[PDB]
Amino acid sequence: ISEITYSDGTVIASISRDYLYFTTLAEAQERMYDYLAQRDNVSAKELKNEATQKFYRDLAAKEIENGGYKITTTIDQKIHSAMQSAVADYGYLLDDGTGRVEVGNVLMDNQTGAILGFVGGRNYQENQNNHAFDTKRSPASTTKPLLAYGIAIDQGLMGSETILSNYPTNFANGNPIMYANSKGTGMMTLGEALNYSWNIPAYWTYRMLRENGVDVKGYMEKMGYEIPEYGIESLPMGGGIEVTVAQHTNGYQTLANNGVYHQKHVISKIEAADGRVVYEYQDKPVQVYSKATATIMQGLLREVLSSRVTTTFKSNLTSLNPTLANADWIGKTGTTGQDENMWLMLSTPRLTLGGWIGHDDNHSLSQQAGYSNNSNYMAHLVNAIQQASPSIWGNERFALDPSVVKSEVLKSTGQKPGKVSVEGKEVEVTGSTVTSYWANKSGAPATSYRFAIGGSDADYQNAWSSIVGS
Amino acid sequence: ISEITYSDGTVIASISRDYLYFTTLAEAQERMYDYLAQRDNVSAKELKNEATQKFYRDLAAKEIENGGYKITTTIDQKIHSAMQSAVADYGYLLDDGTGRVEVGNVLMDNQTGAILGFVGGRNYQENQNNHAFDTKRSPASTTKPLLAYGIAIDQGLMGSETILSNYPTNFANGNPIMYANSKGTGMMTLGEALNYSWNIPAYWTYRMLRENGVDVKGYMEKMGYEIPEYGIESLPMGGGIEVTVAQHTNGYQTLANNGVYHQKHVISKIEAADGRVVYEYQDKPVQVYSKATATIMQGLLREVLSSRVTTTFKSNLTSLNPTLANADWIGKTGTTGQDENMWLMLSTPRLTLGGWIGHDDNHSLSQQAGYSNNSNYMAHLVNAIQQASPSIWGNERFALDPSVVKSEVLKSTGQKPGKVSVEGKEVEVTGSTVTSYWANKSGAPATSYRFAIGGSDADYQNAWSSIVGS
Numbered sequence A, B: 001i002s003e004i005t006y007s008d009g010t011v012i013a014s015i016s017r018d019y020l021y022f023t024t025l026a027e028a029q030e031r032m033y034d035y036l037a038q039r040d041n042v043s044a045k046e047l048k049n050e051a052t053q054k055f056y057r058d059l060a061a062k063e064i065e066n067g068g069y070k071i072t073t074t075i076d077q078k079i080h081s082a083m084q085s086a087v088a089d090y091g092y093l094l095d096d097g098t099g100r101v102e103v104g105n106v107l108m109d110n111q112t113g114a115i116l117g118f119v120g121g122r123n124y125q126e127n128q129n130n131h132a133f134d135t136k137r138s139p140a141s142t143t144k145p146l147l148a149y150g151i152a153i154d155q156g157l158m159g160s161e162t163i164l165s166n167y168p169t170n171f172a173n174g175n176p177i178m179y180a181n182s183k184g185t186g187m188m189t190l191g192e193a194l195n196y197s198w199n200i201p202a203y204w205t206y207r208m209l210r211e212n213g214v215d216v217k218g219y220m221e222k223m224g225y226e227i228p229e230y231g232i233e234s235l236p237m238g239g240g241i242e243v244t245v246a247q248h249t250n251g252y253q254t255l256a257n258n259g260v261y262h263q264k265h266v267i268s269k270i271e272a273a274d275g276r277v278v279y280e281y282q283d284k285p286v287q288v289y290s291k292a293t294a295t296i297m298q299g300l301l302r303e304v305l306s307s308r309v310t311t312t313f314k315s316n317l318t319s320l321n322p323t324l325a326n327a328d329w330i331g332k333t334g335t336t337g338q339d340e341n342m343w344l345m346l347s348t349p350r351l352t353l354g355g356w357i358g359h360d361d362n363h364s365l366s367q368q369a370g371y372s373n374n375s376n377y378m379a380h381l382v383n384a385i386q387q388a389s390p391s392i393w394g395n396e397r398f399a400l401d402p403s404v405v406k407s408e409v410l411k412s413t414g415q416k417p418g419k420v421s422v423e424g425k426e427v428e429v430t431g432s433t434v435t436s437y438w439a440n441k442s443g444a445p446a447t448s449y450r451f452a453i454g455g456s457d458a459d460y461q462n463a464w465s466s467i468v469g470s
């Protein structure tokens, strides 16, 4: 008899009808597949043969059923059981009058990529689809910190108080870029853009990446994302991307871990009965963002939750467990265009918890499913995890890395005071200031007419008119 | 006294208040600018200095006003005067109850790029903007033969009877790709896609280009197009592109000239009074599409006009001048998303005539402005040109190049008959056939499940079900 164990060696099952069983069994079979093919001296070319593959996949499965293998998972028993009890008891809080609402969650150790526990859905016995590991959906606006703002900062094209355009603009096809139901507003800081999750600032950020020839794909593929096509205007908002919850948690793990990626995993080791090691996880840490970038983003994502603009989570949690709400939470929400998918990604320095909700057939949720329902549900979920394992979230604070550069900039331009040109009149650019955080060598530039990320000529004439106004 | 002359040496003016004057004067000043900078030994670096530039631009202008230069244009006097009389007399036919409708046209010699005449607008005295040379607008669906279908054919990814998906699909942001007001239909041939100008087949064609790593930019830049960003889902429909009528005529010149680009020009030579040559046009022909590709596209674009689906032009012309309607006309229309810009591009083997209409402030035209108004106007315009210069359009036929490969293919799959897989059942793929034209070495491939350009799994299950049906 083979067994699957929790991280401490306690047996989960021998080779039983829930997500934990089938998820950890499936991964184990994949590792056994690669092991057996190699053992049998089957090449990459022979492995391409579909008949050969089907044989080796069946071999790997039977090999487990009849062998004496010991499969060590990363799963924490108390934590995972608590997460199942949370979804059983509180999952109904997801139901928003758009029918039954499905859900996936993955809890990940930021320093190892180990998956400590997860939620595959509302109830395996009623619907088996695995929403933590198997289903793939647009990650929506939780794309923005990774693909737009974080890369711009890392490249030194943007600092923490940089200004962006949120003025009306169209896609190349002539359609207005919409956010919720607004065609846009005016200039705004990166923090307001993030807190509100506006679309236009992210569009312009990604265009600025394209114009500077930035290798955005290299960033993403270092985190294990697969995106078929980078030439998409809405990439940074979630367009043209589709991810599992497990994979997306790993992107947020990378930001939370001061920029260092560890590859997600649920199997840590497989041994034969005699102790032969058939598989073992090999850590391959990668510095994906500079420590400066990651720690600047942490600061911004702290205020995404504190501001409470797109999620009630911090209020929900404060009431359930005020001492846990005082841990150093950061996070980002996402909402797709017709309210089909909602995300909330949460981190403390120690753990990252990813969350998605939506419908299996992709029909819309209610306008508030992510702001309120998923926020309140994930608050219960985080409380349940904490109660089951009181120290697991930790009391450490995220903190700016010493390598961060701090510049004094104009609140209005996000750039250092100095002379600028406003047709004719060369002007002394005065007024109240603020510290902006950068991830380059020299920090913020001198103020310059086109001070913002994006903007049309109209936009800048208006902006500078308002500015000059004082 | 300096003068500007027609192509035969007849004086246009000395250095008078219409488009012809200011257009040919402006180009001449640019050529004089480059000449004078070089004469004076001003480097590229010194030329970057904005003060230096302004001086040399003023120098070039005065140099003309006070010198004895002879500026030879490509303009044909009879033809250009006729085009002015046509727009004066018939321009009102553009007015569609969306206010005054502006217009630009450029008539180009396919074998030289010489611009024989043009229409800058409804009336210079009332509105000076030059709509033939200066204003830039999306070319809309006239992008498709150049950037999508023509390049796919040239690369041997597509033949004249290849099948494409027009099933509903969304942009990456989740919005349905719309055409007119339909979310789409089913499979269709390239000819039906072109005749109707559907959007979805062009989207998939361009995606297929991206997936094969095709250097689409190299094609376009060989025709002198400047497109800032190729990573745009709607590129092939006109999104993210903005062109003058003069530049866009030159793309259609390239297709009409069996694939060989000649650079558009309106100045052919400038001489000092003593005969010194200050500037002279240097032909630089480039084979942009293979002769096979260009001649296959000619065949398709013939039927875009003959079918009369998106333009009444051939009917309009048949009535005005039935002997000229029997010349070998090919062409493509374009309409932007809110009916803001309409195009019609027309060629015979000898000439290409580009046409745009729209409003100076970009507000919408009526639903039919391009189908009917601009078609009827351009019919009068072509008749006027012919009457002024009876042989200029020519009686030559476009013809398939001997290098074209012809394959017998299934009407339903656009591919050669053969066995295919339709879950389980391997099937003999029978039924009525047709000759498809290719620009590769081997012609059409054997039929294969994913037979069309684009399509979702749903799409193919449906298609193959219908097919199997017979």
Ligand SMILES: *[B-](O)(O)CNC(=O)c1ccccc1F
Pocket (backbone or CB within 6 Å): A138, A139, A140, A141, A142, A178, A179, A197, A198, A199, A234, A237, A238, A239, A333, A334, A335, A336, A337, B172, B173, B174
């Ligand atoms: B964000 O608050 O989820 C806003 N994002 C979107 O509008 C967006 C646009 C395009 C594709 C996906 C998506 F979530």
Ligand SMILES: *[B-](O)(O)CNC(=O)c1ccccc1F
Pocket (backbone or CB within 6 Å): A172, A173, A174, B138, B139, B140, B141, B142, B178, B179, B197, B198, B199, B234, B237, B238, B239, B333, B334, B335, B336, B337
């Ligand atoms: B064609 O018949 O003009 C259809 N083209 C369009 O819908 C289109 C899409 C996007 C941008 C421009 C444009 F003309």
Ligand SMILES: [Cl-]
Pocket (backbone or CB within 6 Å): A018, A019, A020, A021, A084, A120
């Ligand atoms: Cl489970």
Ligand SMILES: [Cl-]
Pocket (backbone or CB within 6 Å): A018, A019, A020, A022, A023, A120, A128, A129, A130
């Ligand atoms: Cl499962």
Ligand SMILES: [Cl-]
Pocket (backbone or CB within 6 Å): none
């Ligand atoms: Cl064996």
Ligand SMILES: [Cl-]
Pocket (backbone or CB within 6 Å): A006, A007, A008, A009, A010, A075, A076, A077, A078
């Ligand atoms: Cl455990």
Ligand SMILES: [Cl-]
Pocket (backbone or CB within 6 Å): A214, A215, A216, A217, A218, A230
């Ligand atoms: Cl990239």
Ligand SMILES: [Cl-]
Pocket (backbone or CB within 6 Å): A224, A225, A226, A227, A242, A243, A244, A247
């Ligand atoms: Cl992915």
Ligand SMILES: [Cl-]
Pocket (backbone or CB within 6 Å): A229, A230, A231, B231
């Ligand atoms: Cl790209």
Ligand SMILES: [Cl-]
Pocket (backbone or CB within 6 Å): A027, A264, A265, A266, A267
């Ligand atoms: Cl794993």
Ligand SMILES: [Cl-]
Pocket (backbone or CB within 6 Å): A068, A272, A273, A274, A275
């Ligand atoms: Cl053993």
Ligand SMILES: [Cl-]
Pocket (backbone or CB within 6 Å): A287, A289, A290, A291, A292
């Ligand atoms: Cl670093």
Ligand SMILES: [Cl-]
Pocket (backbone or CB within 6 Å): A305, A306, A314
């Ligand atoms: Cl708070």
Ligand SMILES: [Cl-]
Pocket (backbone or CB within 6 Å): A308, A311, A312, A315
């Ligand atoms: Cl709240």
Ligand SMILES: [Cl-]
Pocket (backbone or CB within 6 Å): A406, A407, A408, A443
């Ligand atoms: Cl400073």
Ligand SMILES: [Cl-]
Pocket (backbone or CB within 6 Å): A409, A410, A411, A412, A413, A430, A431, A432, A433
């Ligand atoms: Cl300020």
